[PDB]
Amino acid sequence: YTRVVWCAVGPEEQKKCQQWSQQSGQNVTCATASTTDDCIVLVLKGEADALNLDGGYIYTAGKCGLVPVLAENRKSSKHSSLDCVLRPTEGYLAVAVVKKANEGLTWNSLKDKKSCHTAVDRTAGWNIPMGLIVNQTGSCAFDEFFSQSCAPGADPKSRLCALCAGDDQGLDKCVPNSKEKYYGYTGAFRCLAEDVGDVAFVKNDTVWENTNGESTADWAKNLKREDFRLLCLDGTRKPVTEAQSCHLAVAPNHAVVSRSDRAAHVEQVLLHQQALFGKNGKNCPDKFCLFKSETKNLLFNDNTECLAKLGGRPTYEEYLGTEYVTAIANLKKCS
Amino acid sequence: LEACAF
Numbered sequence: 001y002t003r004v005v006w007c008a009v010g011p012e013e014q015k016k017c018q019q020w021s022q023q024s025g026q027n028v029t030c031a032t033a034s035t036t037d038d039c040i041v042l043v044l045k046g047e048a049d050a051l052n053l054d055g056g057y058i059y060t061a062g063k064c065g066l067v068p069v070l071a072e073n074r075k076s077s078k079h080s081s082l083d084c085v086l087r088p089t090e091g092y093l094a095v096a097v098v099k100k101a102n103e104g105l106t107w108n109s110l111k112d113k114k115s116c117h118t119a120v121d122r123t124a125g126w127n128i129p130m131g132l133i134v135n136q137t138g139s140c141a142f143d144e145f146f147s148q149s150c151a152p153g154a155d156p157k158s159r160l161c162a163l164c165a166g167d168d169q170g171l172d173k174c175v176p177n178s179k180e181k182y183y184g185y186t187g188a189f190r191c192l193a194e195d196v197g198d199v200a201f202v203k204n205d206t207v208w209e210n211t212n213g214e215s216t217a218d219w220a221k222n223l224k225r226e227d228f229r230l231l232c233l234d235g236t237r238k239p240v241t242e243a244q245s246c247h248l249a250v251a252p253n254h255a256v257v258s259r260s261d262r263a264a265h266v267e268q269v270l271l272h273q274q275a276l277f278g279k280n281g282k283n284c285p286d287k288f289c290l291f292k293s294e295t296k297n298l299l300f301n302d303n304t305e306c307l308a309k310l311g312g313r314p315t316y317e318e319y320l321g322t323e324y325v326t327a328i329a330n331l332k333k334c335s
Numbered sequence: 336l337e338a339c340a341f
């Protein structure tokens with residue numbers, strides 16, 4: 001067998017990967033890049049084997065030949081006798097969240113407001129809301145829709161990065177990795193919690209996981225669910241308990257990708273690594289927990305229960321689903 | 336619609 005070389009995006013993920021690599025006796029080792037696209041390039045060159053990706057990045061990786069290997073599976077809404085690794089994945093709900101105190105903000109009054117996005121090219125933070133907005137406005141000018149935004153990955157001098165804050169020192173503003181204070185699901189929800197933006201494009205779980213004491217982090221520790229609303233597409237506002245009926249889309253779960261020729265080896269190594277370090281793993285919490293990172297969703301989402309086998313050896317188009325692939329392709333016609 | 340971005 002061979003070692004599997006994981007790709008970590010940014011220095012926080014690198015730190016976690018190095019701990020995993022130490023704990024796994026170098027069965028896993030780490031390459032690191034500054035952005036998820038750069039990690040996808042390391043994997044295409046064969047200088048890393050694999051990483052776990054949002055669906056929008058699975059699209060970029062899959063057009064370049066990489067394939068899905070195992071998917072994140074979080075706690076499921078319905079009981080099941082099935083082992084987590086054999087349970088079919090239930091996507092997540094992309095939502096638009098605002099503060100309840102920002103009265104009269106709805107889907108239909110988003111123009112000229114301030115927005116918080118996980119990063120350009122991600123499912124809930126960008127592809128689903130910007131795809132809907134281009135469609136509804138009949139215009140590709142999505143870069144002038146919101147007055148200002150934090151959309152990590154966009155041009156840092158542009159209005160799409162004006163709300164981004166970078167790192168402690170204020171460097172790396174708008175970079176699409178965990179150093180940008182408003183990156184990712186928890187960064188974009190923080191951008192709304194702090195009232196830097198009027199709306200955040202995240203998923204349902206983000207709201208729940210960072211409110212009502214679910215997070216002990218300083219910016220989150222006082223947030224109350226009842227102070228947030230979701231924006232529904234018919235122009236109504238609902239409590240965040242109502243995401244099943246007030247979402248923008250259902251997104252395919254994040255998943256691990258690799259080159260075809262290393263997919264079977266990556267899959268075998270990962271099933272053994274989660275047996276050691278996953279939820280109820282032999283060495284978690286004592287030694288190392290692969291699906292924890294103090295809410296920061298480093299390498300994998302912290303709500304992951306396991307990585308699960310995929311049905312039907314799917315292509316990346318089959319894993320994303322034709323509807324979503326066609327929505328992304330439409331959106332990318334713009335730029 | 337078509338090729339790899341890289």
Ligand SMILES: *[C@@H]1O[C@H](CO)[C@@H](O[C@@H]2O[C@H](CO)[C@@H](O)[C@H](O)[C@H]2NC(C)=O)[C@H](O)[C@H]1NC(C)=O
Binds near residue numbers: 093206208241242
């Ligand atoms: C929205 O997200 C939350 C957080 O993941 C979901 O609440 C969890 O649901 C599972 C069961 O599906 C519970 O057993 C967990 O305890 C819940 N977590 C928290 C923090 O309360 C909620 O079900 C999701 N809503 C929708 C419509 O999917």
Ligand SMILES: *[C@@H]1O[C@H](CO)[C@@H](O[C@@H]2O[C@H](CO)[C@@H](O)[C@H](O)[C@H]2NC(C)=O)[C@H](O)[C@H]1NC(C)=O
Binds near residue numbers: 131132135324326327
């Ligand atoms: C944006 O609008 C386009 C045009 O309708 C959507 O593309 C269609 O999606 C449906 C449902 O999957 C297909 O039956 C059509 O073939 C697609 N049309 C075209 C011209 O490609 C797209 O789904 C919309 N985007 C979002 C995010 O909803």
Ligand SMILES: C[C@H](C(=O)O)c1ccc(-c2ccccc2)c(F)c1
Binds near residue numbers: 071089092250
């Ligand atoms: C395979 C993937 C996943 O969650 O792992 C996935 C998830 C959800 C869908 C899906 C598409 C439209 C409506 C509801 C679900 C889909 F086509 C693919």
Ligand SMILES: *[C@@H]1O[C@H](CO)[C@@H](O)[C@H](O)[C@H]1NC(C)=O
Binds near residue numbers: 024027272273
């Ligand atoms: C390293 O992997 C090999 C082959 O699967 C195995 O014999 C060994 O137990 C693994 N150890 C860890 C700590 O991941």
Ligand SMILES: [Fe+3]
Binds near residue numbers: 054055122123124251
């Ligand atoms: Fe996502």
Ligand SMILES: [Zn+2]
Binds near residue numbers: 249
């Ligand atoms: Zn729906």
Ligand SMILES: [Zn+2]
Binds near residue numbers: 313315318
């Ligand atoms: Zn198939």
